[PDB]
């Protein structure tokens, strides 16, 4: 499924991402845009046997288990396929585990390089929520 920005924002807000660890809601919407272009089924294979899954591109070597990545850690204790759903609940739950402090969004390269320092609030302004 491909989300519209306001639709994704409303969903992320319902799951408690607004101001989670001090990160305003725009940060999460901005990260999703640059990581998966709002596509829940987005997948990307990395140089290593790793693969990033879903709306927030969660890595299969450290966070989810796909049963193909060498030395899987699976710190979120959940199947990668579960992250490729129209329901973002699983993805958000995992992201919440990834961001343990106020600097945790650095877990997403796209966010650090293309969102941090910009007017991320622009992504949600005018949305109903």
């Amino acid at each position, epitope marked *: 499924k491909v989300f519209g920005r306001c639709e994704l924002a409303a969903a992320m807000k319902r799951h408690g991402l607004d*101001n989670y660890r*001090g*990160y*305003s809601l725009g*940060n999460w919407v901005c990260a999703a845009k640059f990581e998966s272009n709002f596509n829940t089924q987005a997948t990307n294979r990395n140089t290593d046997g790793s693969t990033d899954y879903g709306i927030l591109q969660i890595n299969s070597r450290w966070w989810c288990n796909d049963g193909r990545t060498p030395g899987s850690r699976n710190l979120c204790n959940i199947p990668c396929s579960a992250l490729l759903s129209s329901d973002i609940t699983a993805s958000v739950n995992c992201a919440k585990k990834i961001v343990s402090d106020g600097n945790g969004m650095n877990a997403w390269v796209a966010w*650090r390089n293309r969102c*941090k*320092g*910009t*007017d*991320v*609030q622009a992504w949600i*302004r005018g949305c109903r929520l």
Partner: antibody
């Protein structure tokens, strides 16, 4: 340690163009915005404008035509430039770091007086 | 521009008291409001952001609340170091504006 320090001329006439420098350390100007704020003697805080991590600038509506903010990431410096100086421009000027919609660190400020 | 009406202009209180400072916006600022404290001859310091979140190092006797257009900063059991000026500022788009300020002085 995050730090910001302002540097200015202290005194200027209506004929001169004001230029204030904000030197930062402890963080990268590409990851945070920097706001400029002033405070007239015995008055409150007034927002002047800002420059985002991406170089974009936004200004106070009633001062946009006289304001100009720029920066040099390599030198870790942000500049505030003003012209058409009025006596009402007398005040202490501060630069402050913006992090996700809050100004978390402020400079000590620099006092500016505008005469004839 | 969105204007912030802050009140009261001044407050006289003694140590131990509980005071409330309010800031009303001329438009919905969607919780993007912060509070600052300024001591005589010092730079403002961030106290609260996004309406209710305390900044690092700020004591829990400070609490923020609000939604829509009415916001408040409550200080429970005022302490000697709490006296000074307080300002609110909104962060919805630009330009940003500040409240007129509130002076908290001792009795």
């Amino acid at each position: 340690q995050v730090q910001l320090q302002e540097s200015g001329p202290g005194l200027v006439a209506p004929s001169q163009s004001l230029s204030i420098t904000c030197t930062v350390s402890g963080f990268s100007l590409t990851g945070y915005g920097v706001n400029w704020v002033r405070q007239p003697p015995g008055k409150g805080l007034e927002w002047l404008g800002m420059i985002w991590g991406d170089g974009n600038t936004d200004y106070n509506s009633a001062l946009k035509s006289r304001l100009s903010i720029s920066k040099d990431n390599s030198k870790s410096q942000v500049f505030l430039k003003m012209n058409s100086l009025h006596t009402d421009d007398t005040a202490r000027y501060y630069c402050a770091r913006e992090r996700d919609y809050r100004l978390d660190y402020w400079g000590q400020g620099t006092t500016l007086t505008v005469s004839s | 521009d969105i204007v912030l009406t802050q009140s009261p202009a001044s407050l006289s209180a003694s140590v131990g008291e509980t005071v409330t400072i309010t800031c009303r916006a001329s438009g919905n600022i969607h919780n993007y409001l912060a509070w600052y404290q300024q001591k005589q001859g010092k730079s403002p310091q961030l106290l609260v952001y996004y309406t209710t979140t305390l900044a690092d190092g700020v004591p829990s006797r400070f609490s923020g609340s609000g939604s829509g257009t009415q916001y408040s900063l409550k200080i429970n059991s005022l302490q000697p170091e709490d006296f000074g000026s307080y300002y609110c500022q909104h962060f919805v788009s630009t330009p940003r504006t500040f409240g007129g300020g509130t002076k908290l002085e001792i009795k």
